Design a protein around this ligand. Structure first.
Ligand SMILES: O=C(O)CCC(=O)C(=O)O
Ligand SMILES: [Mn+2]
Length: 409
């Protein structure tokens, strides 16, 4: 279930020499993939200079009524991201914003964090280690959020070789954190990156099965929405490991989101991973390096090794309290360093996780932390909400809220 390598630099030299032999024309393949990424980069910059946003936008009512056309789905799968509006009523989402604020003010969350290490003393928090607020629990179990997540999961190819790699019609809940960012606040440093593994995409054999069409030279056949092999990838044991397989990451806007307001940026290129994988196999890269990728860190995309992709960094469309935005698990994303806007940028991290044997194993340990009010196993054991006034319990759960947490009822 996990990857174990003692000497990583030596393994990189061995694997790169192994990949270069199986693909002796690795430079010819890269310059053709670069041509496919270049035209997408230029198409993205055409829209931004024109007044449009390259991130596709949909309304939740269109999804629920079944009005999404096949061309809208093809644009989501090519961009690898989607902003979905009106998932929750704006009146409730704006109230959810002030409920979490009162939830933190009531239990004195600021002083608790300080009282709970010099490096811990440094860490004005903007990402909050709370997981069981009433707005968080209620939004995960909303029927409109569930229908949206079912639609996103049905964009994937779930079946191959007589095997259903996940259930796109069943949804599980992955408890995550929340973000509250005020204007003129300090940057976090979330440079363009990809979550879910870094050098493991080259070293682990299960990862190379997902990207087998890239390493074989037939890059045109690589589908970022093919589920085969993705729940079986191995990562290094690190705090940056998500125990669940998420088809789409995403959050819900508690406050209006604006450009140059310290909010999310994305590179809307679904197959950008093909460019990154073949980039590290070129000759201007040292034999022991995979373009700065490090174990235990998110796969970084920089101006030094990927100047073409940096040109396509696009802000997300303007959102209101109640709109959501999702992006593929291989999509490069980042957060604006400065918040020069007026309204704060508060979001709730709520991804889209389908049912599979891998995700089902995480539910019992996740539910145990909910009943206790502790932190989920994938996060630092802060256990802030153990004695919190107003913490959401099982009494706050609906029938959908219990089926998605593994509760049998
Ligand atoms: O835009 C945010 O709120 C954080 C984005 C991010 O780094 C993530 O969710 O992985
Ligand atoms: Mn991230």
């Amino acid at each position: 279930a996990s990857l174990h390598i003692d000497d990583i630099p030596a393994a990189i030299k061995a694997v790169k020499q192994q990949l270069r032999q199986a693909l002796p024309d690795y430079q010819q393949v890269f310059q053709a993939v670069e041509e496919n990424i270049r035209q997408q980069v230029m198409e993205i910059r055409r829209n931004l200079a024109e007044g449009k946003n390259p991130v596709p936008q949909l309304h939740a009512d269109d999804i629920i009524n079944g009005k999404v056309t096949e061309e809208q789905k093809a644009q989501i799968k090519q961009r690898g991201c989607c902003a979905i509006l009106g998932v929750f009523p704006q009146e409730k989402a704006t109230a959810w914003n002030r409920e979490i604020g009162d939830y933190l003010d009531r239990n004195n969350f600021v002083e608790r964090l300080k009282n709970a290490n010099y490096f811990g003393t440094l860490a004005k928090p903007q990402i909050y280690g709370i997981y069981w607020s009433t707005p968080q629990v209620e939004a995960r179990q909303d029927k409109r959020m569930q229908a949206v997540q079912i639609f996103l999961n049905n964009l994937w190819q779930t079946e191959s070789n007589g095997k259903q790699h996940f259930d796109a019609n069943r949804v599980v809940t992955y408890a995550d954190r929340t973000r509250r960012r005020p204007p003129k606040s300090s940057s976090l440093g979330l440079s363009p990156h990809v979550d879910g593994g870094s050098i493991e995409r080259w070293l682990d054999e299960n990862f190379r099965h997902v990207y087998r069409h890239v390493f074989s030279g037939q890059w045109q056949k690589y589908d970022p929405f093919a589920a085969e092999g993705r729940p079986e990838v191995r990562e290094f044991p690190s705090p940056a490991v998500c125990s669940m397989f998420r088809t789409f990451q995403g959050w819900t806007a508690l406050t209006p989101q604006r450009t140059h307001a310290g909010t999310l940026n994305v590179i809307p290129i679904a197959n950008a991973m093909a460019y990154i994988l073949l980039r590290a196999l070129q000759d201007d890269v040292a034999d022991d390096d995979l373009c700065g990728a490090a174990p235990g860190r998110a796969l970084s995309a920089s101006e030094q090794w990927h100047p073409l992709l940096m040109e396509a960094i696009s802000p997300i469309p303007d959102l209101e309290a109640g709109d959501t935005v999702f992006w593929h698990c291989d999509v490069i994303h980042s957060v604006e360093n400065e918040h020069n806007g007026e309204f704060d940028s508060n979001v709730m991290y709520i991804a889209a996780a389908p049912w599979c044997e891998k995700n089902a194993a995480y539910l019992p340990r996740q539910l145990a932390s909910f009943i206790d009010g502790r932190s989920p196993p994938d996060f630092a054991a802060d256990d802030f909400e153990v004695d919190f006034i107003g913490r959401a319990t099982i009494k706050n759960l609906t029938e959908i809220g219990k089926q998605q947490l593994g509760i049998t009822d």
